[PDB]
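User: Earlier you gave me the apo prediction for this protein. Now I'd like the version with zinc ion bound, so I can compare the two side by side. Same sequence as before, with the ligand SMILES added.
Assistant: Got it. Here's the input I'm using:
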Amino acid sequence: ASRGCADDAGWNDPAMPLKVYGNTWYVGTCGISALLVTSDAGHILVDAATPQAGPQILANIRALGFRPEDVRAIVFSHEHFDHAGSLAELQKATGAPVYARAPAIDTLKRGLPDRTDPAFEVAEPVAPVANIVTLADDGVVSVGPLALTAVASPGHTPGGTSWTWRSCEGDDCRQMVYADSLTAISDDVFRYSDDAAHPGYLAAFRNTLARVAALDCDILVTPHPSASGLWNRIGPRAAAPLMDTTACRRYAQGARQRLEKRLAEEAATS
Ligand SMILES: [Ca+2]
Ligand SMILES: [Ca+2]
Ligand SMILES: [Zn+2]
Ligand SMILES: [Zn+2]
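And here is the structure of the complex with zinc ion:
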């Protein structure tokens, strides 16, 4: 029997791919999520993991019997190297456009962020993405019968987005939420409390927390699977229900607590 994935798994440690629910499949690594949402008209790939992950994601898509060439749209959570790292590689393999909100586009074209990213100084360089479609902050990405709805989630980064859609097993349909990271982490310079350096940024983070908390959610997944306890819910170590309609609310509430802890840490230092 396979032993499954650890909660502190390396970002590049391989995961056997497996159904989340209905036509939503997990194709990421043990430490970093990626999802494939499938239809007989084509597929949507959600996230690209770490600049090293192109081949594992492609192998996992094929392991499930899907063709990368049948992917018609790529979306992602946020423009850090551990989630956007293999976007260019995946666009070449699929021929699919990458959808991105305005505040992520320059980062995707450069392959590095600028100082608007809290984690600017610890960024690793990425391959630029050649074909980007600018996504409105409440935009819908449609491929055949598939429809993924964007929820703009700035805070962890300027360009972060959460995604939501419905997947069905027969007549039993679930609202899936791939909620962006909500951790208030940074490099050694950035201060969330320095509004003059980034006006409105922290207010936008608080707004993101409230919006995520309010989403209709049946099944939550997060870019770092441990942030939503994914490996306690699917795979060999599963011991808790996959569906939990309180998950988004608890996720955002915990994130708010941690954000306020970060603000207390900033108040304590010069
Ligand atoms: Ca419902
Ligand atoms: Ca996360
Ligand atoms: Zn990040
Ligand atoms: Zn991350």
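For your comparison, keep in mind: The pocket of calcium ion (ligand 2) is lined by residues 181, 222-224, 227 (CB under 6 Å).
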